[PDB]
Amino acid sequence: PKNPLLEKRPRNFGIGQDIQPKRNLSRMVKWPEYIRLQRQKKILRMRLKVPPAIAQFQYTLDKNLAAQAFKLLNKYRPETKQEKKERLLREATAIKEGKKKEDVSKKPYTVKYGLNHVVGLIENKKASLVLIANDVDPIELVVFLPALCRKMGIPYAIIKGKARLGTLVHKKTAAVVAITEVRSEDKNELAKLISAVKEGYLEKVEDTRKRWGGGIMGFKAQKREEKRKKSLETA
Amino acid sequence: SQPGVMYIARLPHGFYEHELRGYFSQFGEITRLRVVRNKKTGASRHRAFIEFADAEVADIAARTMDKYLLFGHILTCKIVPPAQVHPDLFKGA
Amino acid sequence: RKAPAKFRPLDYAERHGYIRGIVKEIIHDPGRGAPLARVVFRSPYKYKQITETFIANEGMYTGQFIYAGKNAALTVGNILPLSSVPEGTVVSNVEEKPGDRGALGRTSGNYVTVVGHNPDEGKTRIKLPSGAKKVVPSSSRGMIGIVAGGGRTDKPLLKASRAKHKFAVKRNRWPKTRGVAMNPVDHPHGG
Amino acid sequence: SKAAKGAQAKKAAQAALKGVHSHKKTKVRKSTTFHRPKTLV
Amino acid sequence: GALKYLEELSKKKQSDVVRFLLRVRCWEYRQLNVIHRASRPSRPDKARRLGYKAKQGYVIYRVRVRR
RNA sequence: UUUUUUUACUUAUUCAAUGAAGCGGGGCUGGACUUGCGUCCAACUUCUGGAGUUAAGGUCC
């Protein structure tokens, strides 16, 4: 049995009654200027009309195709410092016993990276697959890359994460990665990935890459125009 | 209202009746389903027909799953029109 | 002078209901012909009370409850938006825009007359003490009544000392030298 | 209902193309004042 | 490399893409402080031909002046 | 495709307020008109110079 001395003291939160309870006021928080600036920058890029060469970067690989591309490319990460030190020790041993370094070292296969290097490979038509980060700032560094790849007939895809590409190439960020050639046991996987990129990314973005982006209205303005159109239709 | 029929091909080995029913029931409930199979062996011919109860549910599933890279196969997911749905397509489903 | 004579800032309570304050003091403000009223309101968001300084309308008294908001009664001393008052109501400290805490009809014996309402676009036509007509948003607030202390200028000052006492607390230029009493270097009227 | 069927199909499509991490926690802030966080000195 | 393309694009200041970028960056720099540090050059080809390097000891500061 | 006119919009720019506290859109309840269920409009404190703040409580653990 409950104690008879326990009492309920409900509070009325109407106007002029008891003090208002502490609510979530995060929508009305006075933010620091850097937070307010980055949010407003994103909003302004949504509100203005975006030319197609920039707006094409909103169309990226889906989760499955990005995971398959990373599954292939994670077998071709560049040499670490320890691995290079061990290789150089073995080559120094071969030179000491009077052998060429190519006798103890095989031809490497790596993911190609560095923007100038990859642009050179595309222009020489050596790249077989090009992956471009969607968030390179300044955007001008990669804004010509889909046009260049289309002119050279190279399969490309826009993928989310310069940091994600940096994890491939042992860096913090990477603007672009390319595959030129792989090993014989992964040639079939690369060809299947290239066909998947062509049929599931490039054909699907063939029309949407030519459109203008942005021009989205804010919430209150959208509701205002909906109410205005409803009133015009009613009257 | 009207059912929707999806043709799915490039099926990897293992994407069979129970797997297809369970996977596409996430999109919407399935009226009928048949994997095309060889009578001499029982082996799959890497294609199947799924009749969803609802048409744009079938359309959403097909546009989602078309060109999906699954175990080395780029799937073929298409909506077949009701005019070319065969009357005996789901015999044995 | 301690505090400026302003309304409360326009908040949720005044926008949607009413809030009650109590008139604690009616005080003299140097340089101003009209008395001021100190009114204490509750803070809806905290335990501490808030003291406000209004221009006192005639008939306000210490110990009186006044009401500020949309649903406040049409009674002297109450603060209402102009959309909540009928035509012909006289008010004081009328806001030019809602939330400017009062701009029009502030000196002693003066008031603003609500002439008309246009509810379609939410406007209110008012008449100012100078006789000018104005259109203000209907959500602009005003205090019902006439500013206290009227008839102040009916009495002659009668003495240079009384004029001096009036203007010394006001900072206005006194005494005033005529331009024609000056040399030509000082005034265009000089000479 | 037809709207519910469409909503279910849309949710399955969103899961297939983007994954299942669709939601994110945000702090409840009972004040409108932002204070600089206290860090190691 | 990409810097030849960047130079040829920076010549086209009245094109749609460059005018969009200039407009949004002008808004952002107007919201920032009058003098503030840039984390990286916003025109890497121009900075490199003027002598900037991605080496410790090179900094970029952005400044607006009344014209 | 361009030149004028007005006629809307908001994203630049400008003004003001606040401790950036309740804006916009729905849901619930009540009232009206309507059509035979869509709008708009309202929720909350008015006899008194008192007091109102450390959540009471419900329900799963």
Report residue D18 CA to chain centroid gap: 14
Q: Is the CB of A19 under 7 A from strand F?
A: yes
- Across chain C, the runs of DSSP E, i.e. the strands, are 18-27, 36-42, 49-55, 65-69, 79-81, 90-92, 112-118, 123-127, 133-137, 141-144
Q: Which helix (H) or strand (E) holds E62?
A: strand E60-63
Query: For every residue of chain A, which 3-state class applies, written as one string?
Result: CCCCCCCCCCCCCCCCCCCCCCCCCHHHCCCCHHHHHHHHHHHHHHHCEECHHHHHHHCCCCHHHHHHHHHHHCCCCCCCHHHHHHHHHHHHHHHHCCCCHHHHCCCCCCCEECHHHHHHHHHCCCCCEEEEECCCCCHHHCCCHHHHHHHHCCCEEEECCHHHHHHHCCCCCCCEEEECCCCHHHHHHHHHHHHHHHHHHHCCCCCHHHCCEECCCCHHHHHHHHHHHHHHHHC
Distance D5 CA to F39 C1' (A): 30
Is residue C172 annotated as involved in ligand binding?
yes
Instruction: Indicate the residue type of D20.
Output: V
Q: What is the DSSP letter of C46?
A: S
Distance from CA of A65 to the nearest CA of D (A): 9
- Please choose, from the candidates C17, C22, C18, the residue with its C-alpha nearest in 3D space to the C-alpha of residue C50: C22
Torsion angle defined by CA atoms of residues E53, E57, E63 and E67, in that order, rounded to the nearest 10 degrees: -60
Question: How crowded is the C-beta side of D38, counted as CA atoms within 13 Å?
Answer: 0
User: Under a CB-based contact definition with an 8 Å cutoff, are residues A159 and A134 in contact?
Assistant: yes
Cα gap C125→C123, rounded to integer Å: 7
Q: How far is CA A174 from CA A169, A182, E38, in A?
A: 7, 20, 20
Chain A residues inside the 8 Å CB shell of C12: 15
Q: How far is CA C11 from CA C17, C18, C43, C98, C139, in A?
A: 10, 10, 11, 11, 12
- Contact: E9, A140; criterion CB under 8 Å: yes
Q: Which helix (H) or strand (E) holds B44?
A: strand B44-52
Cα gap B50→B62, rounded to integer Å: 10
Q: What is the DSSP letter of B12?
A: P
User: Under a CB-based contact definition with an 8 Å cutoff, are residues C53 and C37 in contact?
Assistant: yes
- Please choose, from the candidates B15, B8, D18, B7, the residue with its C-alpha nearest in 3D space to the C-alpha of residue A65: D18
Report residue C8 CA to chain centroid gap: 13
Resolution (angstroms) stands at 2.1
Angle at A54 between CA A48 and CA A60, to 5 degrees: 115
Angle at A35 between CA A29 and CA A41, to 5 degrees: 115
Instruction: Using a 7 Å cut-off to protein CB atoms, list the covered nucleotides of chain F.
Output: 9-13, 16-25, 43-50, 52-53, 55-58
Q: Which of D5, D8, D13 sits opposite B64 (nearest CB)?
A: D13
Cα gap B23→C86, rounded to integer Å: 68
Q: β-strands C79-81, B44-52: how paired?
A: unpaired
Chain D residues inside the 8 Å CB shell of B56: 6, 9
Which residues on adjacent β-strands are paired with residue B4? B52
Cα gap C153→C162, rounded to integer Å: 13
Residue A194 near chain B (CB below 8 Å) = no
Q: Which helix (H) or strand (E) holds B93?
A: none
User: Under a CB-based contact definition with an 8 Å cutoff, are residues A142 and A166 in contact?
Assistant: no
Q: Please name the nucleotide lying closest to C50, CA to C1'.
A: F19
Cα gap A65→A139, rounded to integer Å: 24
Cα gap A139→E42, rounded to integer Å: 9
Q: Which of residues 36-55 of C touch A (CB under 8 A)?
A: 42-47
- Contact: A192, B69; criterion CB under 8 Å: yes
Nearest CA in chain D to A22: D30
- Residue B92 backbone zone (phi > 0: left; psi -120 to 50: alpha; other: beta): left
Cα gap B50→B58, rounded to integer Å: 9
- Contact: A23, D30; criterion CB under 8 Å: yes
Cα gap C52→C39, rounded to integer Å: 5
Token pair 């009701």 in the structure block, residue = B82
Determined by: cryo-EM
User: Under a CB-based contact definition with an 8 Å cutoff, are residues A209 and A200 in contact?
Assistant: no
- Residue A114 backbone zone (phi > 0: left; psi -120 to 50: alpha; other: beta): left
Cα gap E5→E9, rounded to integer Å: 6
Cα gap A24→D29, rounded to integer Å: 5
Distance A32 CA to F27 C1' (A): 34
- The two three-digit tokens of residue C163, written as one number: 């004029």
User: Under a CB-based contact definition with an 8 Å cutoff, are residues A128 and A155 in contact?
Assistant: yes
Q: Which residue of E9, E10, E18, E20 to mutate against A (max A Cβ within 10 Å)?
A: E20
State the alpha helices, DSSP H only, in E1-67. Answer: 3-10, 16-31, 44-50
How many helices (H) and strands (E) chain B has is answered by 2, 6
In window 201-230 of A, residues with CB < 7 A from nucleic chain F are 217-221, 223-225, 227
User: Under a CB-based contact definition with an 8 Å cutoff, are residues B7 and B28 in contact?
Assistant: no
Q: Which helix (H) or strand (E) holds D17?
A: helix D2-18
Torsion angle defined by CA atoms of residues A160, A161, A164 and A168, in that order, rounded to the nearest 10 degrees: 80
- Please choose, from the candidates B73, A214, E46, the residue with its C-alpha nearest in 3D space to the C-alpha of residue E60: E46
Cα gap D15→A235, rounded to integer Å: 43
